[PDB]
Symmetry: D2
Subunit: 481 residues, 4 copies
């Protein structure tokens, strides 16, 4: 029509369709300029200033790229301009539901603040998309470019959140099933969302990315699998897919789960919880919401961003003193002190309901040394991190379909033994990090003794620095010697 | 405390001395995390999310690099750990005085809001440095690492702003003159500050940087010039310096003075001006300041960042409706409309006192064409932009000293004719951009007719699109052919 | 056969059509793996190992990109798959005629070895393309993919060399004129060939490129200019084009005309000249050719690459001793010694026929100092380098057509004065570099005295290091001081 | 006479000491400009034009970096300028022994040509270093810069090849043990050689590198481990080291063992074997050597490079017809055809003595498919590729020492279970690739049936494409269904 050109550092010159421009140029979309992609990460990696907004353009752009590519290779798929635009729109909009500091909000804050509700960024994205549509008169614009809003909005939301609830989708039929594998791939997780963040986060973080999305796209084809058309990878490229999940895991270990970044996320959460009663956000009809209740009114949620942090930091209301103090502690780098890191053994798993009980456990361990300070449950933070290949215990590569040079229309499967013996044996594990809220040297030492003792007690793995931090405790455990 | 290692995307792994960590970990320094480097630029270049904070670490790092390098090549300079630390500190701190949206604040807002006061980021940086020092008990830490606060604080501020009041400096004597040429080079402008921003802005903007600071540093030496020790470049490398200023010009043309970015800056300024009476920021002793008066109290200025934008945007105060509306217009992409761009001719220059009178001039032109809509002065914005090589009319390369392979201690001068005939004739020009506040089709057409007529009237250059936008007006002027 | 995917460092994953694969997979094309892009450059820039082969794939790929892009925006152009393939083929093949060490061969060797012949890489490329086609049965394969060999081969050669010989081309008609502006743009020089080399050479050289080809392509349109369809740039993008030529100039100053690289090129040439009688290359019908006569037989030229250097280096024939010695001198880094660099003044220019007379002139200058050695003409090399914007004295931007946002189908012109006063006044100049073949310290000093005297004599510019290398000579000339 | 600066694309501006320049500027060193780093890799990865020469400068530069860094952190190590220079020299020179096409020579050609002798690049490097030293009068230059040639040359060779002769080294004593861990790390393989090639190969190959050597160096310290001084990593960084080996394995899978690159290596080897009797290279005293015997005379080996390929390709000697033909087949892309790829199962391993018997085994399998063509042993190539983490069956991280934030001088050990459950179970495996030398469609089909049958017979893993290429063979094996 008249394409708008945007210069992205990761993707270069992107073209945006007028319809996408209209969706972008709304308060609900522009809100994402005020939400850091990596949350507390930026307080550790000074390069990670980037916000969800730019990620969103990238995801939208990549969605478009993959759908166009599948189109050009296989006209028999009958992919229409209508289909392309919906995949683009879903890509653009699948981050609409992120809250202040991204993962912090949906990962730490809302679980603690509103444990009765179950909340996901996906649900938020659907709701906010709905709000964006209705507040900005998008439906006629969609119609103007040949979209059918009733069906297409369904399709778009399904891309975002999954089956709305044996074919479960209502936005498109089975012959178009592959379209659901682009923006948010519930089948195996190979989706353009990941591709943008691997590239963009790395560009910002200052750590370089091993994975080539352009290659993946060139080698992508659609084939029949059990009477559904699905996206297939080239057989010989399976190694690259294993690599992709490895890359995801690396970025977690190096950046997204960084020990200090996590604590900063935790401290911001603590502050928000303490501020929750006193901060007001005005939603629909002038009705007032809290940080924790903004998820209930999309008009209010529109105005909930990283700005909440500075609203607290700059406040003078005495009621907000407690929250303000925690943020000040963050500024002076008076952070909770990292004690150590350990893992469960065998397939012992620690469920979410047990998280609360863990600080108590550490405080209750009885190391056989004299300690100048005695510490209590409240003095300890235990952070449990699930590291997996995106499908709990399962190997996502078992959920990928492949094709061979010699027969491109014929989908096959490849098992782990068929690829390499050097690949992981398991695909999920847990990290336990322990910090101490008491910052002084005497407290830190004591915390370490409790911690290493607790590790021994529960038959967790030997802390890497165990012999150094707790020389008196490590000889007790036979396995460690 | 010992050395902190920080991963920067531009520079890789930087080391920060404990003393620099102490300066960084303060409200006054951390404040820079909340100020966008390129201001409104981010609303045009979605990559340009970066803030002054990260730039500052880079500038500090680069300052350290150059001073260390000079040290290792020339021990005769007697550069001490004390010297290095001060150059690092100056580098770290020469952005402390930046206001919300960087250049917008000191370039547009303060000139309009407080025309009586004369305000520079440099002055702000000195003041905020002072405030940082005094609020955080830095002086004993400086002493602990062998600095002499009285002299060294002087040295640091002099690096930031220039002579504080025949050798004019009091922080260091003549034999150390070259130290003043690293962080903020008043002699010719080749300084590490530029080097960081060229690299970092490019990384973010998605433009590619063609200038090599590491090469410059390798080839840098200190030589005696008229009984002062100054930083000299290798003769052969002069072409690279011409290139460096060209690069600066390119970044201005392409990014920093982008027509839409400038308008967004302008609209944000307008909003702030309209908000100025109602937004209140608490400074020292609970005393209240306005956006325009925060520069008077450093405690208040500490809390003045990009956050002001969102404070306005999210306000419900009826008094703030006007300002809030402008920001909403920015969000809906209802911007002032670009009319055109022109320049003066010959030696005609446009003085600062005449800026106000220019909208009136455009509205007063008599196009000799029938118009359905008539426009007024207030419907036009005229932005005058000075593009120069950093030294007004002068060629900064004439203020650089060089040395030869054959005699490394002997400074020479190189003239323009000695380098290339293909270099610029002049080193300063002006751009005049005109926008119209009336957005509709009929108004835009009219604005163009006035504008092109005005250009003709004043013997400005023919707008590039003159024949297209104003076909009736362009034939009048003979010079335009 | 379907698409072959090839992973290029600059361009990422390229697709090659089966027809292109067939052209590539021939001795005539694979020959380009054995010819360094930057010739002697690699002996200065250790990164510059790249060969013409890879450049060729890139130029082919970019040709395809531009033609496809024009196609997608403007179906009214009626661009066919046939057209695309021919543009691709031309792009792929316009380096086929390069000789050993690239520019060394066509720039230094053939002019000296065969002054009667006029030889260009373009002519060579046409000839070699013809040989490739005929030796490998390409014409039927072309037909198989819907090319019409008679017309299409003509089109391809015309793209490479210009009109083979008021519309001069026979491969396509006027309505398709813009196709001639892609691979080798005789009109203004903005062509994909440059785009690949800017990107690739920089990647290898370790110097970074300022210019964005992908942006150019996004903003490219075809418009009617004087009843021909031509490629037009967007008005506002003119600044970028001036930048492009500046970039070209920079790469010449920094890399392609580097003083040592040029001498190495010169020494290699000298060696080849001395080896010319004794090296034999077998051509068509078992007939034998020399380095200098291989351009006469394409079968022999096929076997003429950088390999001749090592054939000489490794030779034991006493007849080859002289040539072998020069190459050995290159290996021991016993190079001709750089004396200095100067330029003409005003409009005086130095014609190609006068190059020979210049060594004599330097040797004949009478500096008023006592010298222990006296030097002769043959001891001096004078290298004259033309640096220009690709169209001799002319400004190539005067040969570019533009379009405006408001009227995309309407081509306009933009003059220099309409863009910036900071742009170059002239577009062509000459560098004179002088080296001395006598390497010892006494000879070097003497050579400098002759040289600086000669500069004075001819009213050339003062060498940058004049006061250092020749302190006795420089005071004589009033203008210098 | 003084320091050379050289611009490397990977490392930027390197400084080279005069002594290093003298070593570089010799026929023995310059020879490495004519040996492709990745051998046949360039015929698959068009970017991989780079030669051993440039790699060598990088390895030398990085060696210098690590030794300097250890120096600056720990002056108590007593590292001298002498030590630095020797580590630089070893780094610079540990590729001197590479033959034409690098790994082709030492991996395929010499094993086949001279099975009686055991030959390594390391041994070649030592010999060539000796030859370089003696032919170029380096010993006096070494003395001039404060080296003691007898001791230092010993040290240098020991760095390259291991103990020349309870402390086994004679070049330095135990207190300097860590110096042996920089250039060629026999303990665990973490050496600067790898660091350069990861960076450089990636830069050229067009794959991005996910390992950060600069980070490693910043975190490196020397500690006492069992009364030897060793290079230790920070505890927290162990995950990065696991990543490093994973990256090495990826580069092997993706680039260094690429199926086509390996075949091209194999074809070049075949050609050389066929050329071996007729190519003559003149060594010391005019005595004549063959490709296979050049390793016996360093004077001859000096003149043995990639140039042998082109000597063959351009030859007219009828005796060389057979070798010439194979190279011509490479040019026409008439390569031996990839049949398939398989692995052993469980801990079954395939002995080196059995490699020769494997083609026979494939030819002897009796597939139940109807075939027009019967193939013989000589029609099949069976390539067994050992992929491991550089220490056979062993995990190199078990051979790394670590230190903790809290006690930097105290080395500890970290086991696999202490790091992650998602790490590899084994650290060595085998790939079996089969090609067929008969190129035609009918032969290829037959070869596949033999191959998949052979796989079944020997209880190898099911080829990835087994059910597609050999549908008639695959149902026989129960395990595969
Ligand atoms: N010269 C440049 N080089 C690189 N990127 C640029 C340049 N100019 C602008 N950009 C970036 C900024 C934006 O992300 C994107 C849009 O480009 P630009 O043509 O400036 O848009 P615009 O909307 O101001 O132009 P138009 O006048 O056609 O509306 O490209
Ligand atoms: N694995 C990694 N690779 C690259 N950059 C990293 C990695 N881990 C952290 N970084 C970045 C983030 C920070 O800017 C910087 C320092 O990281 P890190 O050494 O983990 O700090 P830290 O303060 O947590 O460690 P310590 O235990 O030494 O106090 O480097
Ligand atoms: N995993 C990889 N990642 C990046 N580039 C790769 C990878 N594998 C190969 N390449 C490069 C090498 C070549 O330039 C290009 C061709 O890819 P590749 O798939 O290896 O071709 P191929 O011809 O060997 O396979 P096939 O003929 O079986 O499809 O991509
Ligand atoms: N302007 C440049 N920018 C980047 N790299 C450059 C530039 N000029 C040269 N190089 C590269 C080429 C070589 O790798 C290295 C050495 O450059 P250069 O300074 O020209 O040495 P040189 O030996 O010719 O100078 P001199 O002999 O006068 O010291 O840097
Ligand atoms: Mg998802
Ligand atoms: Mg400045
Ligand atoms: Mg050209
Ligand atoms: Mg090794």
């Amino acid at each position: 029509d008249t394409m708008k050109v945007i210069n992205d550092p990761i993707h270069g010159h992107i073209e945006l369709h007028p319809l996408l421009v209209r969706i972008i140029d709304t308060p609900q979309f522009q809100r994402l300029r005020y939400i850091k992609q990596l949350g507390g990460g930026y307080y550790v990696f000074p390069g990670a200033s980037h916000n969800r907004f730019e990620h969103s353009l990238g995801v939208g752009y990549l969605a478009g790229c993959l759908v166009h590519a599948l189109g050009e290779k296989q006209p028999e798929l009958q992919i229409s301009e209508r289909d392309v635009l919906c995949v683009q729109i879903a890509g653009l909009c699948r981050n609409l539901g992120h809250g202040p500091f991204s993962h912090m909000f949906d990962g730490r804050f809302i679980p603690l603040a509103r444990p009765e509700v179950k909340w996901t960024h996906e649900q938020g994205s659907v709701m906010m998309f709905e709000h964006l549509i209705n507040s900005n008169g998008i439906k006629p614009v969609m119609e103007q470019y040949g979209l059918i809003p009733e069906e297409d909005i369904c399709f778009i939301k399904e891309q975002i959140v999954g089956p709305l609830e044996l074919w479960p989708y209502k936005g498109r039929p089975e012959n178009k099933s592959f379209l659901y594998e682009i923006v948010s791939n519930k089948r195996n997780g190979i989706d353009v969302d990941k591709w943008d963040y691997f590239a963009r986060d790395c560009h910002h973080l200052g750590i370089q990315n091993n994975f080539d999305y352009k290659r993946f796209i060139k080698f992508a084809r659609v084939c029949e699998v059990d009477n559904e058309l699905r996206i297939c990878a080239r057989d010989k490229e399976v190694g690259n897919l294993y690599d992709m999940f490895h890359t995801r895991n690396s970025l977690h270990r190096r950046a997204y789960q960084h020990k200090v970044g996590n604590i900063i996320d935790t401290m911001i959460t603590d502050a928000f919880l303490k501020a929750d009663d006193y901060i007001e956000i005005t939603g629909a009809g002038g009705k007032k919401y809290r940080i924790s209740t903004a998820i209930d009114d999309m008009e209010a949620y529109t105005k909930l961003t990283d700005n909440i942090f500075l609203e607290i930091l700059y406040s003078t209301d005495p009621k907000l003193k407690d929250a303000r103090e925690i943020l000040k502690q963050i500024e002076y780098r008076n952070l909770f002190k990292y004690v150590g890191e350990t893992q469960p053994t065998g397939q012992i798993k620690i469920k979410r309901e047990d998280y609360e009980s863990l600080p108590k456990e550490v405080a209750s361990a009885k190391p056989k040394v004299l300690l100048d300070v005695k510490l209590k449950a409240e003095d300890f933070i235990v952070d449990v991190i699930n590291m997996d290949y995106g499908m709990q215990e399962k190997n996502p590569i078992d959920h990928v379909s492949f094709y061979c040079k010699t027969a491109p229309n014929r989908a096959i499967r490849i098992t782990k033994n068929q690829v390499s013996q050097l690949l992981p044996e398991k695909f999920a594990e847990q990290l336990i990090r322990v910090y101490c809220k008491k910052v002084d040297r005497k407290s830190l030492y004591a915390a370490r003794q409790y911690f290493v003792q607790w590790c021994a007690d529960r038959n967790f793995t030997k802390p890497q620095d165990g012999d150094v931090i707790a020389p008196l405790i490590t000889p007790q455990k036979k396995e460690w010697n």
